[PDB]
């Protein structure tokens, strides 16, 4: 059991590290990446109590580069972190649609409920209004729909008649016809429960010569296509979705650090064991190994601790 004294000792050691000549990043990492998010909140509270300064602010001053990104993201609650990443994806004249998509397509009803609330508290506007302001067309419709966090909950009964009718409707709305009935697609894929849709997408293969992902690639393009492809992966197998995004983030020249960092920070306490298992099964070497090859120094050490172990 983690006590008040534990948080005070951690805060004391972190202050010690920060004020050490040259900054002791190793201690800061060893501690923070090996505490739960709730413990890090306790630690920040104790830190402020002892120094009269905010821990996030002190660490922003003490750290730099990608390490600073990792540690500052770890210091936020899950909902704060997601809300701030959403805010960042909409900042400026452009939109980081990949990041917007990743978060909105993968978060559950309960996660999105908290994100909607916390985003309103942090930025004083509803998440939905910022999404509307940054997006347009069917991509906007889909994002707004998902961000409500009102998907049907997993039922007690498998609705086989509806599984079949939804599969038919997805087919009739897309591959069977000229053009696409995109509102039908949005309705089915946002409203039905996840286990229901897993079965719908399998039944869909009975009607369509192409599976759901290939059908999306044939029917739609741009941000809308990107969004549906991410959504369907999240529904089918979310740990594998994140394993693939991690792989993509490191596979080539350099690193998409913003994605690597966000996934390691946000999934470390959620489903990191399943992500690792899917990753190792598909890629043959561990997530740990890929992080090792792509990153270096204290930053690498922090990501490896968030990974939690080799496979």
Q: How far is the CB of 67 from Ca ion (least distance, A)?
A: 9
Which of 57, 64, 110, 136 binds Ca ion (CB under 5 A)? It is: 64
Nearer to Ca ion, 64 or 125 (CB): 64
CB distance 264 to 70 below 8 Å: yes
List the interface residues with Ca ion, window 281-310 (CB under 5 A): 294
Nearer to Ca ion, 196 or 249 (CB): 249
Which of 114, 134, 169, 298 binds Ca ion (CB under 5 A)? It is: 134
Span of 51-59, 94-102, 193-201, 270-278 interacting with Ca ion by CB under 5 A:
94-102
Nearest to residue 169, comparing CAs of 189, 150, 152, 195? 189
250 binds Ca ion (CB under 5 A): yes
Per-residue interface string for the shown chain with Ca ion, residues 135-164, x marking contact by CB under 5 A: ------------------------------
The site for Ca ion, by CB under 5 A, has a size of 10
Q: How far is the CB of 226 from Ca ion (least distance, A)?
A: 16
Which of 44, 83, 90, 167 binds Ca ion (CB under 5 A)? It is: 90
Q: How far is the CB of 2 from Ca ion (least distance, A)?
A: 27
Nearer to Ca ion, 22 or 209 (CB): 22
Q: How far is the CB of 140 from Ca ion (least distance, A)?
A: 13
Q: How far apart are CA 177 and CA 207, in angstroms?
A: 13
10 binds Ca ion (CB under 5 A): no
List the interface residues with Ca ion, window 181-240 (CB under 5 A): none
Q: How far apart are CA 246 and CA 266, in angstroms?
A: 12
Q: How far is the CB of 14 from Ca ion (least distance, A)?
A: 14
List the interface residues with Ca ion, window 11-40 (CB under 5 A): 22-23, 25
Burial code (b: 16+ CB inside 10 Å, e: under 16) for 238-269 equals bbbbbbbbbeebbeeeebbbbbbbbbbbbbbe
Q: How many CA atoms within 13 Å lie on the side-chain side of 282?
A: 19
Span of 2-10, 115-123, 128-136, 258-266 interacting with Ca ion by CB under 5 A:
128-136
Q: How far is the CB of 97 from Ca ion (least distance, A)?
A: 10
Nearer to Ca ion, 136 or 206 (CB): 136
Q: How far is the CB of 75 from Ca ion (least distance, A)?
A: 13
Residue 122's alpha-carbon distances to 19, 116, 117, in angstroms, are 30, 10, 9
Residue 243's alpha-carbon distances to 123, 147, 264, 274, in angstroms, are 31, 23, 10, 9
Nearest to residue 208, comparing CAs of 198, 218, 220? 218
104 binds Ca ion (CB under 5 A): no
Nearer to Ca ion, 116 or 215 (CB): 215
In the complex, the residues that contact Ca ion under the rule CB under 5 A are 22-23, 25, 64, 68, 90, 95, 134, 250, 294
């Amino acid at each position: 059991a983690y006590t008040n004294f534990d948080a005070e000792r951690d805060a004391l050691n972190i202050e010690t590290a920060i004020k050490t000549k040259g900054v002791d990043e190793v201690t800061i990492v060893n501690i923070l990446t090996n505490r739960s998010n709730e413990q890090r909140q306790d630690i920040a509270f104790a830190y402020q109590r002892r120094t009269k300064k905010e821990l996030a602010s002190a660490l922003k001053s003490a750290l730099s580069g990608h390490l600073e990104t990792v540690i500052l993201g770890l210091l936020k609650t899950p909902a704060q972190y997601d809300a701030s990443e959403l805010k960042a994806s909409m900042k400026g004249l452009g939109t980081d649609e990949d990041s917007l998509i990743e978060i909105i397509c993968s978060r559950t009803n309960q996660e999105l409920q908290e994100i909607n609330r916390v985003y309103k508290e942090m930025y004083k506007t509803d998440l939905e209004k910022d999404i509307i302001s940054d997006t347009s067309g069917d991509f906007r419709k889909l994002m707004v729909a998902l961000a409500k966090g009102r998907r049907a909950e997993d039922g007690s009964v498998i609705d086989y008649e509806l599984i079949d009718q939804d599969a038919r409707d997805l087919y009739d709305a897309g591959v069977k016809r000229k053009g696409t009935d995109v509102p039908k697609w949005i309705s089915i894929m946002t409203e039905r429960s996840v286990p229901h849709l897993q079965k719908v997408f399998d039944r869909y293969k009975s009607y369509s010569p192409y599976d759901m992902l290939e059908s999306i690639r044939k029917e739609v393009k741009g941000d809308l296509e990107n969004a549906f492809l991410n959504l369907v992966q999240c529904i089918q197998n979310k740990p594998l979705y994140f394993a693939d995004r991690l792989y993509d983030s490191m596979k080539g020249k350099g690193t998409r650090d913003k994605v690597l960092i966000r996934i390691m920070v946000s999934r470390s306490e959620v489903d990191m064991l399943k992500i690792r298992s899917e990753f190792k099964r598909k890629y043959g070497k561990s997530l740990y190994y890929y992080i090792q090859q792509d990153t270096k120094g204290d930053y690498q050490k922090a990501l490896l601790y968030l990974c939690g172990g080799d496979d």
